[PDB]
């Protein structure tokens, strides 16, 4: 909410999660806000996901601006448990980072484009 | 006295209960005789009746009835 500056259409979010699932199986993904933050800082992140139902918001507040000054693209997901399940967890996840997609580098790259356009 | 611990343990759970209700009755009748100022007493027994009853209840507990 305070860290969310644009709304992601339901359909876009689905494509994103889908891509994430094929990423854990075909490529590599980082689950958890601490491991995600480090991707963005180490530059190994290609697409980072951030939940919108995070409380406290402090846990994710930094993702946006951090991602911006690092070129890394990011997309918002409404449900915290959907991102976690998509990432392959039995629990939820406040943030995730597709560290080098897999058999999705295409859809992924396009999702990044759709969002950049979503302003 | 007249009723020892061995003899209580050599009784079946049902014999202790039958023996128990028997002692209670002797007791109750001793108290009645007493309540009537009856002198045919023998103090040593009305006291033994209480202890005998305690022994039986103690054993019923130890044995599991």
């Amino acid at each position: 909410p305070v860290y969310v500056d644009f709304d992601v259409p339901a359909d876009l979010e689905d494509d994103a999660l889908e891509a994430l699932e094929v990423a854990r199986d075909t490529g590599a993904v980082k689950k958890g806000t601490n491991e995600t933050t480090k991707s963005i800082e180490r530059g190994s992140a290609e697409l980072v996901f951030v939940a919108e139902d995070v409380q406290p918001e402090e846990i994710v507040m930094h993702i946006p601006e951090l991602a911006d000054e690092k070129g890394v693209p990011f997309i918002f997901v409404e449900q915290q448990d959907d991102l976690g399940h998509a990432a392959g967890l039995e629990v939820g996840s406040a943030a995730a980072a597709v560290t080098d997609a897999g058999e999705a580098d295409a859809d992924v790259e396009d999702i990044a484009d759709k969002v950049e356009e979503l302003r | 006295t007249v009723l020892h611990v061995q003899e209580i343990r050599d009784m079946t759970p049902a014999e202790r209960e039958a023996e128990l209700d028997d002692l209670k009755t002797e007791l109750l009748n001793a108290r009645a005789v007493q309540a009537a100022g009856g002198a045919p007493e023998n103090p040593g027994r009305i006291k033994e009746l209480r202890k005998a009853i305690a022994r039986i209840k103690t054993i019923q507990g130890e044995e599991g009835d």
Binding site: - | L28, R31, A32, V33, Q34, A35, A36
Partner: protein, 81 residues
């Protein structure tokens, strides 16, 4: 566990009740109700209890005046004890 009946209450007045009204008098546990007294009494003396009256006495015990049916004779029930 406490017993209902404690002992027969035998006094001049209890005799008159026994001889003239077919009633028996007992000292019972003060936690006992008329019903419990009626039952306990029947099971102990094999008689039919018609009515029970109670009183918490200035001795700290409860007194029950138990009347037996015309079928039973108080005088006799009391003589065997």
């Amino acid at each position: 566990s406490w017993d209902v009946i404690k002992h027969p209450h035998v006094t001049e007045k209890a005799m008159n009740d026994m001889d003239f009204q077919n009633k028996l008098q007992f000292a019972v546990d003060d936690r006992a109700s008329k019903g419990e007294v009626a039952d306990a009494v029947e099971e102990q003396y094999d008689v039919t209890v018609e009515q029970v009256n109670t009183q918490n006495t200035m001795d700290g015990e409860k007194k029950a005046v138990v009347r037996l049916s015309e079928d039973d004779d108080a005088q006799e029930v009391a003589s065997r004890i």
